Symmetry: C3
Subunit: 189 residues, 3 copies
């Protein structure tokens, strides 16, 4: 693989911490509710949740490095700004989840579009699309299995929130950027 193990671990941990903050926000606001008492929880989340998101973060970063022309000009502040945009968008969905589906979903889509315009490229959008499909699909399956549920006013996408599509998209764009950064920041001559 193109990421070094240490880089993959840092990205995994980054994704895990951001996931725990966002998922705690969803749980405490009632955006989601878990129904899986048999597993160990970490904060408000089943232990496998930050592992799934952390693994997705490292995986999408790796994916970008297999797509054409990773950008060598990516900076730490672009990456910090991107992580902040995704986390801010994530927690915002917790704050506004009880509002009507159209303005809520449009707001998240606007945040995701702006994130991509500022920070992303073509391959980054591709990674964004991959997880914007896979992310919600995994959630839909987990919800049908009774593992957790969304609030009834935020479950319009086959049991899950429509805002997941642009939320995951923005996540993929930023994870891709993190992969580019991991390579770019290596020692140079």
């Amino acid at each position: 693989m193109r990421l070094r193990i240490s880089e993959a671990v840092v990205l995994f941990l980054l994704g895990a911490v951001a996931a725990l903050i966002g998922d705690h926000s969803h749980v405490v606001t009632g955006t989601t509710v878990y129904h899986t008492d048999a597993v160990p929880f970490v904060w408000s989340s089943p232990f496998w949740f930050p592992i799934l998101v952390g693994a997705a973060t490292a995986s999408l970063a790796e994916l970008r490095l297999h797509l054409p022309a990773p950008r060598d000009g990516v900076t730490a502040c672009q990456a910090l700004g991107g992580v902040a945009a995704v986390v801010g968008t994530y927690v915002t969905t917790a704050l506004v989840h009880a509002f009507p589906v159209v303005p809520v979903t449009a707001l998240v889509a606007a945040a995701a579009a702006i994130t991509w315009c500022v920070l992303g490229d073509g391959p980054g959008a591709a990674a964004g699309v991959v997880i914007a499909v896979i992310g919600p699909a995994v959630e839909i399956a987990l919800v049908q299995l009774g593992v957790f549920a969304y609030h009834p006013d935020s479950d319009g996408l086959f049991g899950v929130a429509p805002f997941l599509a642009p939320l995951y998209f923005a996540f993929g764009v930023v994870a891709a950027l993190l992969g580019e950064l991991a390579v770019a920041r290596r020692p140079q001559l």
Copy 2:
């Protein structure tokens, strides 16, 4: 005129679609209520609403092309980012309309100022001012005619929301940018 017909039509449709999303958001949250049952509606809006906003979008873009030095360096992502900023701001007003007038209006003004700082120029601000006056004036007349009304906690500007001023301003800045883009993206040598 400086826009080609095809460009004017694309801008018209862009404005119309964004208007329908924002206006649906206002209606469904109770920010506004229509009182005009005799006309055909499109989604939540009287059919003439997206036509008015769509026409304003093409008109403000055209206006910019008659003002000094349209920028040749405008990009599709600046335009996408600007449309996203205006739509995100529009739907946000639907979410926060019931809150006190000062923080609500200040929030929209901040979003509009940031939009202009990132994307706008002097002539763009001029176009912004034109519609920040005309937009609210048209709405005030329509409200006095009983065509629609604002929620009583969002009607402080002669029957309409004070946030319309910075919302329309941001709209004008972005419409101007769309006009610059329409010309810039034409085939080059």
Copy 3:
């Protein structure tokens, strides 16, 4: 001092006006409540409030000019954009203060991180840290003295809101930028 008196006065007034808008927003939404009837108020604030924040604005700008390499390339739109970001963040805290502490605090921290990534430098972050400590410390003392109080759902940081830390941080970053601008905009050859 490095600021000229006229520059320091403009920064003082800028900070004072922004403070009055943000503090009115906190009072009218019930984020905070004053308990000091014996002093003259200006709008919703004790007269000393805009003086404290105004003085802090000029002071942090001055501080930046004593730190390494003030940037000569700072622009008026960066400064306007930064002031808008801080004011927008400030009024947003008034709108969301009743929500759970983690998503509220994370949202403000994201806004502050993005503000710094876009506009700040190392010394700007240093100024940010200084006031992110001093600001909340002053408030904690004032609250223990019974001068004002936070809403019970926004008082987790020794009687004050945890969001003050990233809010003041963003304030310091932007005040520092204003100091750089004051020098940069002086007449050139």
